[PDB]
RNA sequence: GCCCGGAUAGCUCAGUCGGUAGAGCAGGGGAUUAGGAAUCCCCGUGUCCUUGGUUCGAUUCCGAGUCCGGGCACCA
RNA sequence: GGUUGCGGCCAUAUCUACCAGAAAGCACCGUUUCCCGUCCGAUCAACUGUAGUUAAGCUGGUAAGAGCCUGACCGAGUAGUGUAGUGGGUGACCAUACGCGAAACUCAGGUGCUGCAAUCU
RNA sequence: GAGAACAGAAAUCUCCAGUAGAACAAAAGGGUAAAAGCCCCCUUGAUUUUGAUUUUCAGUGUGAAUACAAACCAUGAAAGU
RNA sequence: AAGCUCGUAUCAGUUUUAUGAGGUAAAGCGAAUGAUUAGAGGUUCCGGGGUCGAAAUGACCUUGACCUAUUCUCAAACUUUAAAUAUGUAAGAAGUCCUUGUUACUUAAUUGAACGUGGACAUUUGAAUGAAGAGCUUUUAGUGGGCCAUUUUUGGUAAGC
């Protein structure tokens, strides 16, 4: 009949990072996760304990609890027309920090430094992110870069 | 019965090959894919004529066999068995089903095999000498009646059946970068270990003649 | 050239394959026990087959490891029976070598009817020191080529000492 | 040797970790020794890595880090001469002494040496360093063997006894020490005290001193040179312990030919690799040679 | 007599009418399923520190 | 036409989880006996339907072709 | 800079062949009373550092080497693809407009980087 | 692969290669090499209290599973499981 | 439908930026697996069918299987690699930092963990666009037979199936 088990449709997802089988390296276990830390989920088929359901593969949540080998993660899941708060209990092999906040915090520190400099100098900060603007009026020159004129080429059989 | 070929002309279903899941299929009608002077050095037959599909469709093994036979008969009658090396550059791997007292459990049983063909896809190809052009073109032209679709006939500017258009081939052959394997060539590269590069191509950096 | 790679035996191993279990196998075990001085070490079946009248996990055969100068003495004994005459196949590409024989009585051990008569397979293994690189846990390794006993090397050794005589090839 | 591992084999070979390729580390053991309760979040799990060469013992206190392991203190068997043990520096007694040394050294450099004074009345009795109420807890450290086999009668456990007797809380059972009757399940402290202070060696010295003296000369020649008999060994090791308990520190060596000197002359024998022009030149020369139909 | 069995037509739109809205965070969240150890301790800690910041008002 | 079952000496029929080709009859030669039926004996003879894989080796393991043999769809 | 020990990332680190390796170190190596263990002191255990050795292990170098890694207006803006049309075509299927954009290949280049401590001419 | 008496396609004993092509009760897939496979020692964590969570999902149950806590135990030299 | 609390407050079927995950299209098989054509040469080790003195534990043939390097074509349940579109998370005042308070938990430890005190950092509160508001609750009808188009797509020869 039908088949809707826990690890259903999980052939290639928890298939393993070709030419990376083997006992997992130890930076995984030496990493440290405090409460209020954002973590991306990427399962490991070599570690059957503490696993997540396939739904939470590729999602990113916040830790709410920490134990001996595992952490407790808050996710928000879309169900129909609402979001539900889910609490997973995962061993840490399936887990890694999120580089997004690292980027935000770098921008924060840079903004602070620029503000201190402008506060020091009585000048302007303008330290939000602006988008990509089009482009100003440039001038090329034909000194040496002469225009090579082109045309289409006709149809030939290259079989 | 062999119901018609419009029922299986087009690529409507995914590919369904003979496998551990689909076993108990019949065997192809076409089993011979290479004919003529198959044992011909690459130097014998510089010319080549490709028969290329313009339509996206399926071709029955039966039709493939028929065209092979007709072409071969034209060659062997006109120019002889040893004036060409015809190669069939398509294999029937796609299995076709029939349903054959209700539409319930209508999953069909294997009827036959077909090769799945794209635009620009080679179907037959020939490697003759330059004096059999009008004959091989007519052979393939006669073959065009034994296929559905549209199947054009192209004169290939290459040396035969491997690659390397004629002047490029001549540079390498005169420069000695070529060894003749059985019916096909091996080339000299500049990557491998230099000893064996020489012991397969002693000439390249040797004053050949 | 020859400081340390001079040459040596690693060990010798003798094999007596009955083809069944029971009295005969234990008798051959006694053979090996008295012959070695070591208490022997048996073998079992791998998978049941009808042609041999055997079954899986059956103690069919016995063998034993002998090593050291005792093994060398007993090697000399066996070679006396082999008449200082050996053939070419007979010989690993890895240099190890061996042969086979009937009536174990022929050297040392007298007859002992209760034991009953058997033959046996001899096979000895050559090496050089530093071989325990391959066997030691820490820094397990593998041999170079300026080392690595082989057929011709062991043949030359085997003729050099024992005043031996190789045969056809 | 014809076994030519093809391009495909090489392409789908997964290399092990470097330390397994070498053959020096079990990462299985390493995980189950390093993984810390994450609700401690940075509490380093200190391991006593004990290694046995053929001519040197290595005792080191180690923590782990993403960048690499980190050593808190270290102790070698060639250092016991500064406490008065010159000969027999891979034996049980030197193992004990090295354990005592690293033990007393850590707590000294850490500030705990006033408390956790260990036993200091050695009789070979199994006992751990209890915790001082109204005071700090004892330092916890877990023995890392490595690839060495656990057997009863081994010299790793001499070092274990030394570390435990020096003041560290080193968790261990007594069922792999020597003199442990197994069917009884009971340790013999007098035998352990003998193995600490060189009783089996000293007994053996007397035994060869009346069984065969050529052998006694060839092995104990350093003892014979330095005017050492069997029964001096207990007093020797005791004095060594006393000096260790006095000053267990790490006074290092003096390093004639310092760092740059070593780099300058003690390592200028390696061949640096060629350049691209040099490879091309070698190939050009090789074709200039190899150009013959032979 | 058969009948269509499943589909998801129109459901997305139905949701999006008054739909998905948002998981509605708050400051000071729950302690559901947290380690009862460190719950038990954090309690005593808050008791003591509240006592402290109280007694600091005389 | 689909659901199933068979293909062996000249005919008929046997195949230990594969090592081999079995039985009778038809049929040559006696034997027999004063002669002959009778019978006892021995000549043989067979891709074990067809080809394909199948393994060390398949004729007995499979898939396809062929010639047959047993069913089948109710109620208006 | 070496070497050792503990490691990180875990092939730019591997594999095949062939060279070299001063200092020490490691390793081989010497033995079998005790602990212990093996059929077997081979392994494992124990004693010595003495009897001998770089031959091997180990390090590095070498090969238009395999493999691996990285890169490129090499392939290829191709294949494929989101959206549009009362666009074409009997149809298959195809082109066109705005956008995204490959892998194969080719060519080039490289072949372990490194943390803590100890020791080393 | 090379070798060895009976002994051969194949019995048992060697040495080399062997990234897993083996095995892990079973269907398929994943996973796995100083193991999760093979041998051997000891064990009864297949136990006790009552909660949380995930999948199915109505965020109901059942089933199954994960992670903890207070207990009692095993095993190991220990970390630990 | 009734509304309720607030009101510029936090939002949004959207993009952008940064970061993640995926195994479909595609591509590929001289990369694994499976399938498959052609030849190469090599398989002294003999597995098979021959000749050579019935001779062969010996050479010459064909003939396998294997070895090496090549070659043609393929996959819903094969894949190294690996798109487009889609998809999750962050874009601060509920913040950034300092400070040192607590605690039966944790530490060798005034170490840690959590949670707080006090102090500095709002013109730009810190991408774009919009916001005819944002949030919340109760209650109840009707519905719980569906159908067509484009594109992807399953069965079927096919269908206004």
A137 touches chain B (CB under 8 A): no
Strand G contacts in C 130-169 (CB under 7 A): 130-133, 135-137, 139, 141-147
Count of beta carbons in the 10 Å neighbourhood of residue B84: 29
Element housing C101 (H / E): strand C97-101
- With vertex at residue B7, the alpha carbon angle to CA B5 and CA B8, rounded to the nearest 5 degrees, is 70
Is residue D29 within 8 A of residue D144, CB to CB? The reply is yes
What burial class does residue B61 get, using C-beta atoms within 10 Å of its C-beta: 0-12 exposed, 13-18 middle, 19+ buried? buried
- Does the CB of B186 sit below 7 A from strand I? yes
Residue to test with chain D: of B176, B192, B202, most D Cβ within 10 A = B202
Element housing B140 (H / E): helix B133-143
From residue D177, how far is each of A39, B168, D51, D181 by CA, in Å? 47, 80, 17, 10
Strand G contacts in C 112-131 (CB under 7 A): 128-131
Give the residue among A53, A54, A60 at the shortest CA–CA distance from A76: A60
Give the residue among B94, B28, B95 at the shortest CA–CA distance from B64: B28
Pair type for strands B57-60 and B49-53: unpaired
Pair type for strands D142-144 and D47-52: parallel
Residues in chain B: 209
Separation CA B25–CA B19 (nearest Å)? 9
Which DSSP state fits C118? -
Count of beta carbons in the 10 Å neighbourhood of residue E8: 6
- Within 8 A of B195 by CB-CB distance, chain D residues are 290
Torsion angle in degrees (nearest 10) through CA of B60, B63, B65, B68? -130
Instruction: List, in order, residues 6 or more apart from E36 with CB less than 8 Å away.
Output: none
Separation CA E40–CA B102 (nearest Å)? 70
From residue E26, how far is each of A59, A81, E29 by CA, in Å? 21, 20, 6
- Does the CB of B32 sit below 7 A from strand G? no
C-alpha of D117 from chain center: 23
- Does the CB of B207 sit below 7 A from strand F? no
Strand F contacts in B 24-53 (CB under 7 A): 24-27
Instruction: List, in order, residues 6 or more apart from D138 with CB less than 8 Å away.
Output: D116, D129, D130, D131, D132, D167, D168, D169
A149 touches chain B (CB under 8 A): no
Chains C and A touch (3+ CB pairs under 8 A): no
Separation CA C24–CA C19 (nearest Å)? 9
Separation CA D128–CA D173 (nearest Å)? 10
- Mapping DSSP onto H, E and C, the string for D4-22 reads CCCHHHHHCCCCCCHHHHH
Residue B184 zone, left/alpha/beta (φ > 0; ψ -120 to 50; rest): beta
- With vertex at residue D58, the alpha carbon angle to CA D56 and CA D64, rounded to the nearest 5 degrees, is 155
Residue to test with chain D: of C135, C136, C140, most D Cβ within 10 A = C140
Is D37 in Cβ contact with A29 (below 8 Å)?
A: no
Separation CA A9–CA A54 (nearest Å)? 8
Which experiment gave this structure? cryo-EM
Interatomic CA–C1' length for residue E18 and nucleotide I111, angstroms: 52
Taken in order D274, D275, D279, D281, the sign of the CA dihedral is: negative
Separation CA B9–CA B112 (nearest Å)? 13
Q: Which residue is nearest to nucleotide G1 (CA to C1')?
A: D263
Is A22 in Cβ contact with D16 (below 8 Å)?
A: yes
Distance between A114 CA and the closest CA of chain E, angstroms: 30
Resolution (A): 5.3
Scanning every strand, the nucleotide with its C1' closest to D67's CA turns out to be G8
Half-sphere exposure of D17 (CA within 13 A, CB side): 15
Interatomic CA–C1' length for residue B200 and nucleotide I68, angstroms: 13
Q: Where are the beta strands (DSSP E) in chain E?
A: none
* DSSP3 helix / strand / coil % (chain E, rounded to 5): 45, 0, 55
Measure CB to CB from residue A65 to each of E19, E21, E34 and give the nearest one: E34
Interatomic CA–C1' length for residue D70 and nucleotide G6, angstroms: 8
3-class secondary-structure state, position C16: strand
**Break sites following residues in chain C (C–N > 2.5 A):** none
- Mapping DSSP onto H, E and C, the string for B150-190 reads CEEEEECCCCCCCCCCHHHHHHHHHCCCEEEECCEEEECCC
């Amino acid at each position: 009949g039908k088949s809707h088990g826990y690890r259903s449709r999980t052939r290639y997802m928890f298939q393993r990072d070709f030419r990376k089988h083997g006992a997992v390296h130890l930076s995984t276990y030496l990493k440290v996760y405090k409460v209020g830390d954002i973590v991306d989920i990427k399962a490991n088929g070599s570690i059957q304990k503490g696993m997540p359901h396939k739904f939470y593969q590729g999602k990113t949540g916040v830790v709410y609890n920490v134990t001996k080998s595992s952490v407790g993660v808050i996710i928000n899941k879309m169900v129909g027309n609402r979001y539900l708060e889910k609490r997973l209990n995962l061993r840490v092999e399936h887990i890694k920090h999120s580089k997004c906040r690292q980027e935000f915090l770098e921008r924060v520190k840079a903004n602070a430094a620029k503000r201190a400099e402008a506060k020091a100098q009585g000048v302007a900060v303008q330290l939000k992110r602006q988008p990509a603007q089009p482009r100003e009026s440039r001038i090329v020159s034909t000194e040496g870069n002469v225009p090579q004129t082109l045309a289409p080429v006709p149809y030939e059989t290259f079989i | 019965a062999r119901r018609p070929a419009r029922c299986y002309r087009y690529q409507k279903n995914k590919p369904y090959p003979k496998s551990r899941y689909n076993r108990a299929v019949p065997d192809s009608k076409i089993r011979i894919y290479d004919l003529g002077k198959k044992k011909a050095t690459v130097d014998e037959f510089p010319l080549c004529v490709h028969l290329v599909s313009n339509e996206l469709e399926q071709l029955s093994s039966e039709a493939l066999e028929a065209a092979r036979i007709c072409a071969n008969k034209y060659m062997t009658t006109v120019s002889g068995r040893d004036a060409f090396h015809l190669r069939v550059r398509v294999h029937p791997f796609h299995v076709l089903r029939i349903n054959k007292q209700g539409m319930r459990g209508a999953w069909g049983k294997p009827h036959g095999l077909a090769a799945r063909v794209d635009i620009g896809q080679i179907i037959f190809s020939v490697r003759t000498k330059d004096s059999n052009k009008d004959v091989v073109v007519e052979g393939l032209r006669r073959a065009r009646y034994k296929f559905p679709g549209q199947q054009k006939i192209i004169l290939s500017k290459k040396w035969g059946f491997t690659n390397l258009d004629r002047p490029e081939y001549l540079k390498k052959r005169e420069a000695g970068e070529v060894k003749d394997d059985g019916a096909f060539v091996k080339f000299l590269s500049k990557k491998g270990s230099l000893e064996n590069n020489i012991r397969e191509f002693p000439e390249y950096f040797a004053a050949q003649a | 050239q020859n400081p340390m790679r001079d040459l040596k035996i690693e060990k010798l191993v003798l094999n007596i394959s009955v083809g069944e279990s029971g009295d005969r196998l234990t008798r051959a075990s006694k053979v090996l026990e008295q012959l070695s001085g070591q208490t022997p070490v048996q073998s079992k079946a791998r998978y049941t087959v009808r042609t041999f009248g055997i079954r899986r996990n059956e103690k069919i055969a016995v063998h034993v490891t002998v090593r050291g100068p005792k093994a060398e003495e007993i090697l000399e004994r066996g070679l006396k029976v082999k008449e200082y005459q050996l053939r070419d196949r007979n010989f690993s590409a890895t240099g190890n070598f061996g042969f086979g024989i009937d009536e174990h009585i022929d050297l040392g051990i007298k007859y002992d009817p209760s034991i009953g008569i058997f033959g046996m397979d001899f096979y000895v293994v050559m090496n050089r020191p530093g071989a325990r690189v391959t066997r030691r846990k820490r820094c397990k390794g593998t041999v170079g080529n300026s080392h690595k006993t082989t057929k011709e090397d062991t043949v030359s050794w085997f003729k050099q000492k024992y005043d031996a005589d190789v045969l056809d090839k | 040797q014809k076994d030519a591992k093809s391009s495909a084999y090489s392409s789908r070979f997964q290399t092990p970790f470097r330390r397994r390729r070498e053959g020096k580390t079990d990462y299985y053991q390493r995980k189950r020794l390093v993984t810390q309760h994450k609700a401690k979040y940075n509490t380093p799990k200190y391991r006593l890595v004990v290694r046995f060469t053929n001519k040197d013992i290595i005792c080191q206190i180690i923590s782990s880090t993403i960048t690499g392991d980190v050593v808190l203190a270290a102790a070698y068997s060639h250092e016991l001469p500064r406490y008065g043990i010159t000969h027999g520096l891979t034996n049980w007694a030197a193992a004990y002494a090295t354990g005592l040394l690293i033990a007393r050294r850590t707590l000294q450099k850490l500030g705990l040496d006033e408390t956790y004074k260990g036993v200091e009345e050695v009789e070979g009795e199994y006992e751990l360093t209890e915790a001082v109420e109204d005071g700090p807890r004892p330092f916890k450290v877990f023995l890392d063997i490595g690839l060495q086999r656990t057997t009863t009668g081994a010299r790793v456990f001499g070092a274990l006894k030394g570390a435990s007797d020096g003041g560290l809380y080193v968790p261990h059972s007594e069922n792999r020490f020597p003199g442990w009757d197994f069917e009884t399940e009971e340790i013999d402290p007098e035998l352990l005290r003998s193995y600490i202070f060189g009783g089996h060696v000293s007994q053996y010295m007397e035994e060869l001193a009346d069984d065969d003296e050529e052998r006694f000369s060839e092995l104990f020649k350093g003892y014979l040179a330095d005017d050492i008999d069997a029964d001096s060994l207990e007093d020797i090791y005791t004095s060594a312990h006393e000096a260790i308990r006095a000053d267990p520190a790490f006074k290092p060596t003096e390093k004639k030919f310092t760092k740059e000197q070593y780099a300058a002359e003690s390592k200028k024998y390696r061949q640096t690799k060629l350049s691209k022009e040099e490879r091309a030149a070698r190939v050009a020369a090789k074709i200039a040679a190899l150009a013959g139909q032979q | 007599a058969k009948s269509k069995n499943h589909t998801a037509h129109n459901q997305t739109r139905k949701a999006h009418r008054n739909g998905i809205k948002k998981p509605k965070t708050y400051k000071y969240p729950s302690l559901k399923g947290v380690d009862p150890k460190f719950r038990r301790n954090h309690k005593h800690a808050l008791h003591g520190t509240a006592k402290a910041l109280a007694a600091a008002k005389k």
